[PDB]
Amino acid sequence: YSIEKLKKEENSLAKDYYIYRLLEKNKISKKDAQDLNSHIFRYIGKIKSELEKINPKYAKCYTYTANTILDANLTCQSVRLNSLVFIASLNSKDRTTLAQTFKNQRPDLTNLLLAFNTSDPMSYIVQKEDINGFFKLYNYSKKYDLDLNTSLVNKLPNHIGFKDFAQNIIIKKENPKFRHSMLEINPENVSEDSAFYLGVNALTYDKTELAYDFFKKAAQSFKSQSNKDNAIFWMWLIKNNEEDLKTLSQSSSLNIYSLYAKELTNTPFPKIESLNPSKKKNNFNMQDPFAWQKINKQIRDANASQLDVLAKEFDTQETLPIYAYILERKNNFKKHYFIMPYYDNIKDYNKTRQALILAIARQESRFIPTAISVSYALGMMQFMPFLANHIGEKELKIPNFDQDFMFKPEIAYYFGNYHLNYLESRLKSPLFVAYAYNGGIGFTNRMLARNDMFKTGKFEPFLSMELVPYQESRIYGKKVLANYIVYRHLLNDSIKISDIFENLIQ
């Protein structure tokens, strides 16, 4: 589509995507580009960069430099010193004068100014127990590491940056002195994700009673049933209390931990809804990405009555993904929908391969054929354009191939099969295939080559699943693995969950 036609659509990821495609080919002119920021839905990343190839209150403050900062007025000094890179570029003469100037009004700035006079700014800030400075320095450089006392570490969780700081250094196995120091955080001082990660940290040093206390505090504070189940599972792995396994087995959340608990207690498999519309198709275009962005907003805004009307409108085989998306919401996410749309395209693969394709598709797109992610992964199977083109143009040599072919379910399922087959041939387990599908086989190979990941051990393979070093893939693998178990069950191709976990140990 030309830019002027595209400008008439409502702002969305689909519109951004097509704006990006034009900017990619150098097909937008300067005149056209000028009003284009009001036409972008998410002005972040690749689209922001490609476009830029085409606060006056504080502007004067940016003429000053490291060499002239003391000539500036108090406001401008204050503004420039919000940058740690700038503070580090000063000399100690100027940092010491500015620290005096700002002592009473901006005491946290004063601390950093003086900190940067020393050879280790972090040690200086740690001595002060300046928590705000601690996180700014961590963001400045991940290289700082030192042993922290009990008083300091127990103040770190009262900052919004603690959760990602902890998660990051734990799952990446970085900053050993910080990590070891966090064994002294009192579980009363943490909750939710922070408590969970500290539980994971404690397990890596084999502090299992401490871990149990952290996981218990997570279980008591998490708002999502899925996260609560994950914490309860660790409570059970550590102390083996029958009531934890029982509670987990009765979860209405369908996830790997509730599923495994049901297997272990002989609890029946959860109820899965069965959708099979009588009508084959209607006039809605399931290959039109703009139409999906529009209807998605309509469904979000609908009350119960409006959802009933929409359900009737999309009650077809061709529109099944939208029908299921409507019913999820009408039932307030309390029912379990595991659809198998456009099934004629996968019916001749074996049932395990079907389950893996369905499991991936369900997590990626909820089967919406024109699904578009924030990084412009495309279609039901959420292929990145570079991969879709590689498979389509190089490997399969499809005549007149375009990346938008990924919006057609026959293509999405066929490419998904092709790529999953390559990943499986190298990784075996559906979990490892999932990690590699989302995060790339490069990161997955490097992770599995580690001597401390997915090898024999007391709490393995469950501990390794918590230490997958990229958050998105860590979560994605767990969700896809649950979906794979359910689809295998639905296809009468059930596998013992315990066998799946045993197959992860190398």
Q: How far is the CB of 471 from ligand BLG (least distance, A)?
A: 11
* H/E stretch holding 389: helix 385-389
Question: Which listed range, 127-135, 224-232, 252-260, 371-379, lies at the site for ligand BLG (CB under 6 A)?
Answer: 371-379
Q: How far is the CB of 143 from ligand BLG (least distance, A)?
A: 26
Question: Which listed range, 177-185, 223-231, 242-250, 382-390, lies at the site for ligand BLG (CB under 6 A)?
Answer: 382-390
How far is Cα 444 from Cα 426, in angstroms, rounded to an integer? 11
Phi, psi of 383 (to 5 degrees): -80, 135
Our finding on whether 384 is near ligand BLG (CB under 6 A) is yes
Q: How far is the CB of 50 from ligand BLG (least distance, A)?
A: 18
Contacts (Cβ under 8 Å, ≥6 apart) of 502: none
Neighbours of 240 (CB within 10 A): 9
Q: Which two tokens stand for residue 432?
A: 């490892």
Question: Which listed range, 2-10, 314-322, 381-389, 394-402, lies at the site for ligand BLG (CB under 6 A)?
Answer: 381-389
Q: Which of 440, 470, 479, 503 binds ligand BLG (CB under 6 A)?
A: 440
Q: Which of 92, 373, 471, 498 binds ligand BLG (CB under 6 A)?
A: 373
Our finding on whether 434 is near ligand BLG (CB under 6 A) is no
How far is Cα 78 from Cα 35, in angstroms, rounded to an integer? 34
Our finding on whether 407 is near ligand BLG (CB under 6 A) is no
Question: Which listed range, 282-290, 340-348, 370-378, 480-488, lies at the site for ligand BLG (CB under 6 A)?
Answer: 370-378
Q: How far is the CB of 379 from ligand BLG (least distance, A)?
A: 10
Q: Which of 197, 383, 454, 487 binds ligand BLG (CB under 6 A)?
A: 383
Kindly report each contact of residues 214-218 with a partner whose C-beta sits within 8 Å and lies 24 or more positions away, as own/partner: 214/187, 214/190, 216/187, 217/187, 217/188, 217/190, 217/191, 218/191, 218/192, 218/193
How far is Cα 337 from Cα 323, in angstroms, rounded to an integer? 11
Our finding on whether 78 is near ligand BLG (CB under 6 A) is no
Q: Which of 144, 196, 233, 437 binds ligand BLG (CB under 6 A)?
A: 437
Handedness of CA 145, 151, 156, 159 (dihedral sign): negative
Q: Which of 442, 451, 456, 492 binds ligand BLG (CB under 6 A)?
A: 442
How far is Cα 503 from Cα 264, in angstroms, rounded to an integer? 17
Q: Which of 181, 194, 247, 438 binds ligand BLG (CB under 6 A)?
A: 438
Q: Which of 346, 377, 411, 486 binds ligand BLG (CB under 6 A)?
A: 377
Point out the residue whose Cβ comes nearest to ligand BLG: 440
Question: Which listed range, 127-135, 160-168, 272-280, 439-447, lies at the site for ligand BLG (CB under 6 A)?
Answer: 439-447
- Burial code (b: 16+ CB inside 10 Å, e: under 16) for 88-103 equals eebeeebbeebbebbe
* DSSP annotation string for 177-242: HHHHHGGG--GGG--HHHHHHHHHHHHHTT-HHHHHHHHHHHHHH-SSHHHHHHHHHHHHHHH--H
Q: Which of 382, 403, 429, 464 binds ligand BLG (CB under 6 A)?
A: 382
Whether a cis peptide bond, with omega within 30° of 0, leads into 461 is yes
Site size toward ligand BLG (CB under 6 A) is 14
Q: How far is the CB of 440 from ligand BLG (least distance, A)?
A: 2
Nearer to ligand BLG, 182 or 377 (CB): 377
Our finding on whether 387 is near ligand BLG (CB under 6 A) is yes
Is 495 in a helix, a strand, or coil? Answer: coil
Q: Which of 44, 146, 309, 374 binds ligand BLG (CB under 6 A)?
A: 374
Question: Which listed range, 33-41, 301-309, 383-391, 461-469, lies at the site for ligand BLG (CB under 6 A)?
Answer: 383-391
* Residue 249 and residue 267 in contact, taking contact as beta carbons nearer than 8 Å: yes
Residues near ligand BLG (CB under 6 A) are 364, 373-375, 377, 382-384, 387, 437-440, 442
